[PDB]
Amino acid sequence: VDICTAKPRDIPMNPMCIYNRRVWELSKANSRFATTFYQHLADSKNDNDNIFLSPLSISTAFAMTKLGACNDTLQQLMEVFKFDTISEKTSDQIHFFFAKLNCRLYRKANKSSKLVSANRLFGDKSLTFNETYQDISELVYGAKLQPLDFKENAEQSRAAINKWVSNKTEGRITDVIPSEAINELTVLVLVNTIYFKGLWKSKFSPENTRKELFYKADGESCSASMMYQEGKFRYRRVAEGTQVLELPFKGDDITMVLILPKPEKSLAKVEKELTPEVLQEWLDELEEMMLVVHMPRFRIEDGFSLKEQLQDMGLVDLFSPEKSKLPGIVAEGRDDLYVSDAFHKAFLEVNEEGSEAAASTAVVIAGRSLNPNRVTFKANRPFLVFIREVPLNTIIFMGRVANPCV
Amino acid sequence: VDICTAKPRDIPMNPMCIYRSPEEATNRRVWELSKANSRFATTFYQHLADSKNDNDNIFLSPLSISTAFAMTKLGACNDTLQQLMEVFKFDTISEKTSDQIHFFFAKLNCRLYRKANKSSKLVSANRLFGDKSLTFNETYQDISELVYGAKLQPLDFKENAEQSRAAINKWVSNKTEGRITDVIPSEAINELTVLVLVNTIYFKGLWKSKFSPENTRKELFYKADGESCSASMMYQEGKFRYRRVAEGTQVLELPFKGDDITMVLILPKPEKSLAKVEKELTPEVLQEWLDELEEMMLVVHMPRFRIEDGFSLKEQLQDMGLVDLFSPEKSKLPGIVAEGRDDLYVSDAFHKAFLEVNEEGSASTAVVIAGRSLNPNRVTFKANRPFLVFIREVPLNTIIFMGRVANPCV
Amino acid sequence: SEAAAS
Ligand SMILES: CC(=O)N[C@@H]1[C@@H](O)[C@H](O)[C@@H](CO)O[C@@H]1O
Ligand SMILES: CC(=O)N[C@@H]1[C@@H](O)[C@H](O)[C@@H](CO)O[C@@H]1O
Ligand SMILES: CC(=O)N[C@@H]1[C@@H](O)[C@H](O)[C@@H](CO)O[C@@H]1O
Ligand SMILES: CC(=O)N[C@@H]1[C@@H](O)[C@H](O)[C@@H](CO)O[C@@H]1O
Ligand SMILES: CC(=O)N[C@@H]1[C@@H](O)[C@H](O)[C@@H](CO)O[C@@H]1O
Ligand SMILES: CC(=O)N[C@@H]1[C@@H](O)[C@H](O)[C@@H](CO)O[C@H]1O
Ligand SMILES: CC(=O)N[C@@H]1[C@@H](O)[C@H](O)[C@@H](CO)O[C@H]1O
């Protein structure tokens, strides 16, 4: 069986609990989550810091988790990630469309650019995991269940996962999981990974690239490689002088969208009004135009916990050792599961040839909730970035590039 | 025998008369003639500006003018020949004979109108319009063509002066993409007219560093009469060769695509009047300045504008020492017309120039600079008051056009 | 810029 080909019947979805044109609605759903989550994540940061992440990655990991969710935990999930808006009736049908969307995203003949995904589960070597849950995850998400000794070797295990994530991200996403995040009590770790690399449909020439002092808000300046190029691009300066520039990759199915507010204007004002529709708006008012493009040759890495923002967004049960409800995962062994924490880590690199972005999400069951990590470095004059799949209307990566000095 | 690759021995000048002037990695001589033409430009520009009101815009092409009279000098003799040599500073090329200036001018011209695989357009066209009835000196005809590419088109000034006038006018128009029309005033040119010498220059280039139309905005421009007016201000930030000179005067160089040609702007501080700077603008001073420019990050404020100027060169030149050439009694141009008529003199000399500056040149573009944070203490250049403008061919150190923007308003 | 003269 190949979910990509099958109909919403050739798949014996047996979720314990419950609560085409649909695919689209799902993408809408994901985008809704994205902007919202971005905004929250935005607050937990300095307006002048870098921010990068794959919303899709997160939406995937938590969808995967939901296969074993139940009661409120299940409902909250559905709503928090807006799946509850997909014209359906069963929390179990959503998964079918997600599989489809993933099919269309990573399974194409053309392949002018590389866009792959890889999901995996890591359960304690001594527990018996419910078979249907195990089978569904491997079918709907290509997520096989790998055994790991959490009870006697939490560390070996963590290092294990981080490395598996490393292999799926060409070594770009390494330490997705913080140090003391996994312990003897850890029951399972759900993981998603996404990897991208596309060639600019119009590369930049290195000769045109020049160094240029970049001024850090509070501080001095650091060297920066600014690229230069002239050509036709779908562009548009909108309200308040904000610019929306679209950079297509070979094939045109995946583009990078830049958003920069007028000089002296603050980006924070834009972020508070960011929405799927708002974004769609700009995406429409774009027109082919001859413009000169100055853009830094850079790369940014970002990592963080998602529990905080997610709780604020509505996900409460799942993280509560008391209220969490994930019966469908473990059949016999150690139940009364809850998510200790959830981590994400993304990477973006841009140059003359094109762009390279990678990300990963890891949800941890019954582990230790490591205190929110952090790595600051205020910069200045940031701009928003987006790498989306146009046909599918999917925001694969998004973020705020603030420091071009890398 | 291509003159552009020819040795002086390959181009016999055999001029009617001769005069002996008294006392990097390019051509030593074209470098010198370049210095020459510039000494004339500044001196002549000073004179010209002094005779003009401070709120008047000014534009002309010293190169065109130097080229015209250099063409005339070919048949000049005695005191007319000297005065020409002296006035147009050619005599300032130590111990060089009046006829060498022409081989040099030949070399200078080759470099300037290279026509190579370039992006900016710089064209020149010289032509002699003589009366079909007259018989011009062969050598004069020959050399005028070999060194300046000027052809001798016969016209009927005796009978159809007016028809002949339109012919000239129409030709200049064509050579100047129609920007320069009725070069010649109806009044001039008549049956008595025997020769009309004409030199045209035409340049069009794109900014090597674009000004986004999207940023062009109205701003007040402050005239020299203490008043203000609304002008279109172009805006952009970037690296340009710049330099803050004496008494806060700001010098800026905006290059065109190709890098061979630039536009230099001289902007005095609001306190100081441009008239002061013009009176001090010495050839050696303008040299020092140009050589001192250094790459830098600055905010550029510069108005769009079109300038059309036209004037007689006669008076100005006379004041500068060119008299015989205009005297029916003192003129000496034996080398031009053959057989009698020897006492030919220049009845008049006119110059008409055009200038248009803006984004694009040739409403459709935009610029997007992502991830840029310039120094909050960066230097700015706001051209909202009169300033000087030059359009030079750097490698050759030649001033093709110069002028003054005393009022870009509308 | 577009300039011409004669
Ligand atoms: C007995 C057994 O192991 N089967 C159960 C079934 O009773 C239950 O209704 C279903 C949930 O829909 O999960 C399993 O299939
Ligand atoms: C509110 C609650 O926890 N009880 C119900 C339980 O009776 C029912 O069998 C199950 C099926 O989805 O849903 C809930 O778990
Ligand atoms: C093995 C176990 O714990 N029993 C239940 C039972 O309903 C069925 O086996 C499955 C179907 O969802 O869910 C759980 O596994
Ligand atoms: C100007 C010119 O063509 N040179 C000759 C000159 O050599 C010769 O001596 C003279 C008559 O003797 O006729 C010409 O002037
Ligand atoms: C003032 C004048 O006309 N006489 C001399 C003439 O005798 C001499 O041969 C010639 C040479 O350049 O110069 C002058 O023309
Ligand atoms: C055609 C004519 O009049 N002959 C003269 C000739 O005597 C003189 O040597 C030469 C040098 O310029 O110029 C010619 O015009
Ligand atoms: C390109 C253009 O429009 N300029 C024309 C040119 O095509 C024509 O060859 C010439 C007459 O020969 O007249 C110019 O004005």
| Ligand nearest to the backbone CA of B342 | 6
Q: What is the DSSP string of A189-234?
A: EEEEEEEEEEEBTT---GGG-EE--EE-SSS-EE--EEEEEEEEEE
Annotation-wise, does B31 bind a ligand?
yes
CA atoms within 13 A on the CB side of B63: 30
Decide if A387 contacts A396 (C-beta within 8 A): yes
Atom of ligand 6 nearest to the CA of B140: 12
For residue B112, the number of C-alpha atoms closer than 13 Å in the C-beta half-sphere is 28
Resolution as reported, in Å: 2.8
- The H-assigned helical ranges of A121-227 are 131-140, 150-168
Distance of CA A368 to the CA centre of its chain: 23
Q: Considering only CA atoms, which of B321, B360, B315 is closest in space to residue B50?
A: B315
d(CA A102, CA A115): 10
Query: Token pair for residue B158?
Result: 């005796």
Are B121 and B205 in contact, with CB atoms under 8 Å apart? Answer: yes
User: Rounded to an integer, what distance in angstroms lies between the CA atom of residue B54 and that of residue B58?
Assistant: 10
CATH of B8-206+303-359, one of 3.40.50.2000, 1.10.10.60, 3.30.497.10, 3.30.1390.20: 3.30.497.10
CB atoms within 10 A of CB A371: 10
Q: Which residues in C lie closer than 8 A to residue B354 (C-beta atoms)?
A: 2-5
Determine the topology of domain B207-302+362-408 in CATH. Answer: Alpha-1-antitrypsin; domain 1 (2.30.39)
Method: X-ray
Q: Cβ separation of A296 and B371 shorter than 8 Å?
A: yes
Distances (CA, A) of B102 to B10, B13, B17, B146, B193: 13, 8, 13, 10, 26
Distances (CA, A) of B74 to A89, A187, B14, B19, B147: 98, 101, 10, 12, 10
- Distance between CA A55 and CA A360 in Å, rounded? 10
Q: What does the block give as tokens for B260?
A: 């061979």
Tokens of B2: 């291509």
Give the whole-angstrom CA distance, residue B179 versus residue B182: 10
Torsion of the alpha carbons at A183, A184, A190 and A196, rounded to the nearest 10: 40
- The CATH code belonging to domain A8-199+296-352 is 3.30.497.10
> Which parts of B210-362 fold into alpha helices (H)?
274-280, 283-292, 314-319
Domain ranges of chain A: 8-199+296-352, 200-295+358-405
A234 is in an annotated binding site: no
Contact A349, A151 (CB under 8 A): no
* Angular region, B275: left φ>0, alpha ψ -120 to 50, beta rest: alpha
The answer to whether B265 touches C1, Cβ cutoff 8 Å, is: no
| DSSP summary character for residue B96 | -
B355: contact with C, CB 8 A cutoff: yes
Task: Show the tokens assigned to A307.
Answer: 């529990």
Q: Is B14 in the pocket of ligand 4 (CB under 6 A)?
A: yes
With both helix axes pointing from N to C terminus, report the angle between B78-87 and B62-73 in degrees, rounded to the nearest 10: 160
Stated as kind and residue range, the H or E segment containing A24 is: helix A21-43
Whose alpha carbon is nearest atom 13 of ligand 5?
B78
Cα-flanking dihedrals φ and ψ of residue B287, to 5°?
-70, -55
Q: From CA B392, how far away is CA B286, in angstroms rounded?
A: 12
Q: How many CB atoms lie within 10 A of CB B384?
A: 18
Cα dist from B68 to B112, B209, B297, whole Å: 16, 34, 40
Q: What tokens were used for A173?
A: 């996403």
Which of B368, B372, B373 minimises the CB distance to A243?
B368
Distance CA B322, CA B67 (A): 15
A9, A97, A295, B295 from A225: Cα distances, Å: 54, 42, 8, 17
Identify residue A172 by its one-letter amino acid code.
R
The CATH architecture to which A200-295+358-405 belongs is Roll (2.30)
| Closest-approaching ligand to the CA atom of A332 | 3
Q: Is residue A42 within 8 Å of A402, Cβ to Cβ?
A: no
Q: Kindly give the distance from the C-alpha atom of residue A29 to the centroid of ligand 7, in angstroms, as a whole number.
A: 61
Cα–Cα distance between B48 and B279 in angstroms, integer? 11
Closest residue by Cα to atom 10, ligand 2, is A17
- Tokens encoding B394: 């750097």
Angle in degrees, 0-180, between the axes of helices A55-66 and A93-106, rounded to the nearest 10? 140
B365 CB neighbours in chain A (<8 A) are 289-292
Cα–Cα distance, B202 to C6 (Å, whole number)? 9
Other Cβ atoms less than 10 A from the Cβ of B182: the count is: 15
Which of ligand 3's atoms lies nearest the C-alpha of A331? Answer: 3
Rounded distance between C-alpha atoms, residue A375 and residue A370, angstroms: 15
Tell me if B296 CB under 6 Å of ligand 5.
no
Q: Which residues of B touch A (CB under 8 A)?
A: 210, 214, 297, 364-376
Sequence-distant (6+) residues with CB within 8 A of A89 are none
Phi/psi at B244 (nearest 5 deg)?
A: -95, 115
Residue with tokens 């008076």: B315
CA A100 to chain centroid: 18
Residue in this structure with the two tokens 């004339």, named with its chain if needed: B40
Question: What CA–CA distance (Å, rounded) separates A234 from A253?
Answer: 14
Ligand 3 residue neighbourhood (C-beta within 6 Å): A 14, 16, 130, 132, 328, 331
